[PDB]
Amino acid sequence: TIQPGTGYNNGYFYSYWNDGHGGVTYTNGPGGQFSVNWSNSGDFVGGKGWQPGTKNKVINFSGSYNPNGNSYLSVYGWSRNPLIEYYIVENFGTYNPSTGATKLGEVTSDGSVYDIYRTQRVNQPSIIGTATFYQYWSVRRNHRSSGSVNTANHFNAWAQQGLTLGTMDYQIVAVEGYFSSGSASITVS
Template identity: 65%
Template sequence: MNDTPAHPTGHRRRRTRLLISVASAVFLAAASLTVAGTAHAEADRTVTSNTTGTHNGYFFSYWKDSGNVTMNLGGGGSYSVQMNGINNSVVGKGWNPGSTSHTVNYSGSFNCGGNCYLALYGWMTNPLVEYYIVENFGSYNPSSGATRLGSVTSDGSTYDLYRTQRVNQPSIQGTATFYQYWSVRQQHRTGGTINVANHFNAWRQAGLTLGSPNYQILATEGYQSNVSSNITVSEGSGGGGNTGGPTSGPTTGGGGNNGGCTATLSAGQKWGDRYNLNVAVSGSSNWTVTLNMASPSVVSSTWNVNATWPSQYVMVGKPNGSGNNFGVTIMANGQWTWPSVSCSSG
């Protein structure tokens, strides 16, 4: 392998991308793997050399180019890994094929202070695309040197969107020229729900072409760093990708003007068990917006707002420096009526 940079700057990512692509091509070409349910739970398994396979109904991938990497495959979608003295390594558990519209739940721990990250990683074909939804990373931002295409707000944070291109480099289809799509979370986390459709829809709306899903894993990656993680991944209930609002409730609405400002609701993404609402405030930049839920629906996450909950079914939001537009995710719990909303200045 050589040290040619992957992006206009930042030679580390080129090596990382290149080596991952080689591993994917070699080991995915070696076997055609699909996720199949197991009749009984498989025993825990320790992996210390390059391989792919299935374990307890999940696809897994292990790859390193040097150093000590121990991956322990546990029950269901769980795995843990210790990386020491490595140059580059990536491991993870997920699905083959993956999906552009499901929800991914994950939890656990991720420890790294160097060049490493935690991401939902995968490939598409027709066209050939390598992609990352980066949830957490160390001292090196994996999108360094890439061109920013915009952002998407999902699951309580803003993700920055990027695209890079690899020219005549190894891939799951041999040596090829292909794009890499990136969605990098601004507020790092190690656990939560990834509404995968939000990211693929954002890439599409940014003018990027999507292909057919290949494999997809919740990956731990390290480059010349000591890394450890303990991750459990699963598929969430319901699917993503619908663009309407809930099954009942206004298309816009607001409670209006209780004291110098107006809050207006509009529909965001909708899934089988939850939906997003966008809240636009006008008339004041120093506002207090109150949402009253229709029981038993509750707010599960927010973005671009300082939120408090005086009670289980009431949310109060104030500006957090991100402007006069914010959003909420509401768990329907069988109740799809939108909340009532009011706004006051100060």
């Protein structure tokens, strides 16, 4: 296990954050590999990828994802100017994070339809400090724990619908959990 923080490991950016509650261990492995094991955690997010991301990256991920409770497996990132937090959700546990969100379209990519949503976060932590910003979501209908994500398909579909992105900040394959248990082992390339 490592300290929470950000850095580079074997040529990949990583980010690991937790709220201090306990119950989460994050390990960086060789190459693009990372592992997360959690048991009655608090809120956390961890994964590997790129800093900065791009608008036409094809992201490959392979491994195992076994949530027991509330957790997501996503391509996850931010843009600046405008400030946007975005998710391309490949798999989740007990909670569909688009519950109660406004549906803004559908896109077919990489073997599934995805539903597109937009939510707003009001006076919440962000990469530039406390702020009000939008979150964009693509939620895969056919869940999986390995695959390839053509991010351009999502970003172009969001743009078509009026959901524009600014300058890319980090872009990772992340395991997120909120007071749950589970294990994951994921290799990014």
